[PDB]
Design a binder for this molecule. Sequence first.
Ligand code: BEF
Ligand code: BEF
Ligand SMILES: [Mg+2]
Ligand SMILES: [Mg+2]
Lengths: 207, 200
Amino acid sequence: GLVPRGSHMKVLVAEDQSMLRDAMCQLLTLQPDVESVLQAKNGQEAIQLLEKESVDIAILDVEMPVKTGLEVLEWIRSEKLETKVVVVTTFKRAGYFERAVKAGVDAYVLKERSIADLMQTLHTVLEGRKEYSPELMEMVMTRPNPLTEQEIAVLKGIARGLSNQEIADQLYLSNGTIRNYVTNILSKLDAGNRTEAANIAKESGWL
Amino acid sequence: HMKVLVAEDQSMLRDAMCQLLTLQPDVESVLQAKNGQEAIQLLEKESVDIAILDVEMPVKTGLEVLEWIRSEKLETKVVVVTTFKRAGYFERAVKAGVDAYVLKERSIADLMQTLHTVLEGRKEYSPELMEMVMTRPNPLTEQEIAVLKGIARGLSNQEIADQLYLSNGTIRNYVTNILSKLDAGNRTEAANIAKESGWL
Ligand code: BEF
Ligand code: BEF
Ligand SMILES: [Mg+2]
Ligand SMILES: [Mg+2]
């Protein structure tokens, strides 16, 4: 995915806080590696701009009037533009990050970063790489135990080679109830069979 | 020329502001703080011409830093720069003798101009917040207004009473209430104040 324009990159900055937008764009414009900087105060303006000219990188705030940066991202991808996308946001919201990634954002970074981190992100994405806020990564790779107390009992049962019927007797439940729980457990753990689910749940520290 | 301090807890904005101020021909140096506690520590050991202060920051807000500056009687002009349009923040800053109070809706060139404005001994108050604060509801009741319109026409209390179908004692009660509401020493003066304040 390397785009060989890193010595003269055309970028767009969409950001609704005027003072920040102004200061970002002035400093980007000053960089030897930046050729030009388009400026947008909200998502609708970003999209109108992108309808009328090409940029190498769209740098996008999330919370903006009219259209958010996530909506602009989703629009750039539906248009198959030859444009990298970097989301730059205050919000450490796991859901925003997930949405961005599903629409193939190239970077997602927090306004806890500096302008130097930002320049580094720009080069990273323009050389075809990805950069994800470590802090958001961490947030999302940490999951609660998804298993109910029953399902945990079932899985312990499974871990001893017990049949569904044997587990039903132990837990004082019907065989059909155990079968449900098993089916349910394969879904929550994306395991293929009952023995797979058991080691995934053990390996993940959930028993 | 200008020795400035910037206190701002959003790292990207702080960094961007500081780098740009530093680039200005008539800024000599820029001190950097990410919270009001750091701002005060810097101000304790270093002299500064202007301190540019975010309101909401960790530990100490720009409003507390402002107050500290003033209590210390520092020869430092203070410019607050904030996202927030909360009237209490604005009113608290003016009462503390802030020199400017502007919104992050303004540009860097706006900010530069503000810096020169305050070093000239002038003030710069967000037009939008000024108008918000200066806009209140009529402090008079519909009945109090009727009495005052009556006073302006030269009517006596009894004449106003008979016009409004009320006892002259009720009218006296209104008048007593109006004089206190408007800080007027007499009825004719209360009427003059209400009319010219645009409340009649
Ligand atoms: F408006 Be935010 F920084 F997404
Ligand atoms: F943090 Be705010 F802009 F006072
Ligand atoms: Mg925003
Ligand atoms: Mg703040």
